[PDB]
Subunit: 236 residues, 4 copies
Amino acid sequence: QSMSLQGKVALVTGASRGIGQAIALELGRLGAVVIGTATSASGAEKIAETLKANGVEGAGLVLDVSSDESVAATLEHIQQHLGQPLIVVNNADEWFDVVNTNLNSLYRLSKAVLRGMTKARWGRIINIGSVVGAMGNAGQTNYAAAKAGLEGFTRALAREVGSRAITVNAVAPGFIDTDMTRELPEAQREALLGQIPLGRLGQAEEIAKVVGFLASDGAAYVTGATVPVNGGMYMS
Amino acid sequence: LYFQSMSLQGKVALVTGASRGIGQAIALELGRLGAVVIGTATSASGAEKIAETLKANGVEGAGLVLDVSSDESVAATLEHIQQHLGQPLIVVNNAGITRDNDEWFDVVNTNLNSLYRLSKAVLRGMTKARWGRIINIGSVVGAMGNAGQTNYAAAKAGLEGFTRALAREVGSRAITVNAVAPGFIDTQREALLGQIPLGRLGQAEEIAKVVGFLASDGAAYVTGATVPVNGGMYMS
Amino acid sequence: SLQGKVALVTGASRGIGQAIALELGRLGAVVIGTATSASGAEKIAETLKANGVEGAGLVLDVSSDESVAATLEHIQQHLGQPLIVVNNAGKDDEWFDVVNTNLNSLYRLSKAVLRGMTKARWGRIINIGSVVGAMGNAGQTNYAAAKAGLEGFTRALAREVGSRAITVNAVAPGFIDTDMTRELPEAQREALLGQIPLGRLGQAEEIAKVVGFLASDGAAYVTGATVPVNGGMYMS
Amino acid sequence: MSLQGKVALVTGASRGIGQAIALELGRLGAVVIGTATSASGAEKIAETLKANGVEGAGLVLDVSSDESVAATLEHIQQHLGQPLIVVNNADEWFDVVNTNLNSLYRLSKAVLRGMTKARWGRIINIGSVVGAMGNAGQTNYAAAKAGLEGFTRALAREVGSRAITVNAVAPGFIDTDMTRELPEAQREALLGQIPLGRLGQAEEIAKVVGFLASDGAAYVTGATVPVNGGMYMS
Ligand SMILES: Clc1ccccc1Nc1ncnc(-n2cccc2)n1
Ligand SMILES: Clc1ccccc1Nc1ncnc(-n2cccc2)n1
Ligand code: NI
């Protein structure tokens, strides 16, 4: 088989809702042992229940990607009980601090999990960009800045780790049906749909399928890529 | 009396330029995923070879003769396919020319005209079925130097812009249009590997896996995208 | 300076083209502006005279090799070789023909004027993209496609002719104050201005000033570039 | 094209591209404050401006320190007026890019008050010159350029409504101190990748910066203008 993730341990941050949950379920369905994380104990319990309800081995844990202690501790804990995670999905005025903080977190987590991947001479790091919602300028500015940061970062880290058969890729979601987007005013939703050639919102499962492919052996020559998953609507 | 459980079961896929290398590998991968595959070549001997290969690999389908530069040949071949096998709802355009057939403008122009010719012909079938996949394969990183870098960048820029525009035109019909941009694919050698983070050439099968994913139902929200498959070496 | 240099500006009878001819003239070039009709050419000649610019208005069909060859010969006969050339002369499914036609015309003209520039070992070719003309969707598709074609073409031609100290650049206008843009409803106008960080439309003179800089000796190391002049609103 | 009546701050103005920018802005009629990280660099800047007939000054600035930035700005307002034109010219890839963007943000954010008050402004960011390299060099260079483009584009959106434009210039291979001293093999290889078949002069970057600082560039914002003789790197 070419799509089996059987025998692998996958860490998926921000797995309690929406895109993160769908990614955990998809990696599990493909046979991985899945560790989903949230920022709170209640989120982590929920993750564990969801995985069990769907017949997936793994666990839910509490993780703050902004803290070196939390990252180090969580990783240790994972190695203790479950093995090295060789698949890692990072899903966890204002634009500069946001992007800066996000990239520092991506770097923190990525750098921590690389030892394990370097040892195993195999790895998959996949970064999930932020969903498209807010309008006028400030939402477009945040969205374009975050995406640009994500592309550059992903491209650079891919170069640094490539010789070790570790691939680093990103997924850039467009307008996806999630908690934030279900709440959005009718006018926003209509405007947005008008910009989308497929004339509909993406499902969270449609992001998860892309992540699952990238995590497979078939994607082994794909690295430094950002795959946009946005129904044909492009926005820089 | 035997139904495959493979993701493209029940579909008919047309793959142009299927007699060698990347095109052959795509035909085999689509077939392995359960599609009925029609591979094309420009000559009767190429087509006969395609048919034998498919048979040797247990794939249902056929090899046919097709000149993507002629409206007659395209119309005729499509009619023939409907006659005997059904509407092809997956189409992979791989048969691009090169300067071996000043040079950058005529190459890119000719290739885009052929992409448009074929795509436009198959759209009626896809429009009726309210479902489709068109995937365009870019050219392999060919010549080493200057005129080679100009041809390569021009072809890739044309491929991206085209793919993005066609995706907009056909999106409302649940037809996705995507592209794959190969880097250095195997079918002084040390210098090259030094420019590639993965430190190796890509296999033709690694392009075929990406095409196979994009043809699936999981890639349904992915459209207008160019997925680079180049081991981390980027050149514009 | 541009003093004593001969500049050919296609589509110079109205708007952006006229503003470019006047700006190049103000910078001291001898300006040949073109139109597709005799009445347009007379108008060009009157405008230049009214503004104290030496030069002429001529009739030129950029889609015809004869017209191009003839017009060039005429220019050499009476005025000298034009070493500055500005190409300005140009529902969801008209994009392919438009872009194709525009690129063939750019190539035709550029290739014709290169012999003169090659002999002088000096040159400036500047390509003006289209304004966001019609709107909604088909207008965004046409615009993005035209711009992508313009960027790739400009970049490739720049590579081909660089060794001869000829620079090839492009200018990508956003929303400029023109006939099409003056005519849309107040709600349209307000929406549009909301998408533009500068909160206003561009003047044609603001395109001309960029062209004038690129034609100068100061821009001699700038080539293959597309300078966007769009008040901060980006749409690909 | 006149920058008469304006005050321009040009960081890293002691050598090469920075010096050429300070001289070009001065030639266009601006009052120019060039900065260096040391007192000797600042003294040199002042002498060069004087030798070339340019009003202004050289001063000491550390773009990585909020105190230095705040102090230098206050100092400029004290003696010369608010600078409405600002040119930012002043394992390893992540810290470099991060630090550079933090410095761009620090300085840009500080000078914006003055520009916001005047409802007019020009911020221009100069990217790094090509080629001090290995593979780690290509990674640093591409990462820095991507950060510069995204940053420039975002800041332009944030400040546009105030008639402040934010742009960038992306140099290719330019004849400078660092590049003259590069191994001859590097230099030859690089020259082979450039369609114009020559190195850029520092003056050729300065001319672009000068144009972008002018009123004629008022509708240009969020742009990164590459100035690289046709050699593009991805
Ligand atoms: Cl805008 C911004 C703010 C902080 C960090 C990055 C960006 N933008 C951006 N755009 C492309 N690449 C990067 N980058 C790459 C490595 C580190 C930052 N950053
Ligand atoms: Cl003809 C050509 C030559 C060199 C580089 C590009 C092109 N054409 C081109 N380039 C980018 N986009 C497009 N495009 C988009 C829709 C149709 C063509 N066409
Ligand atoms: Ni324990």
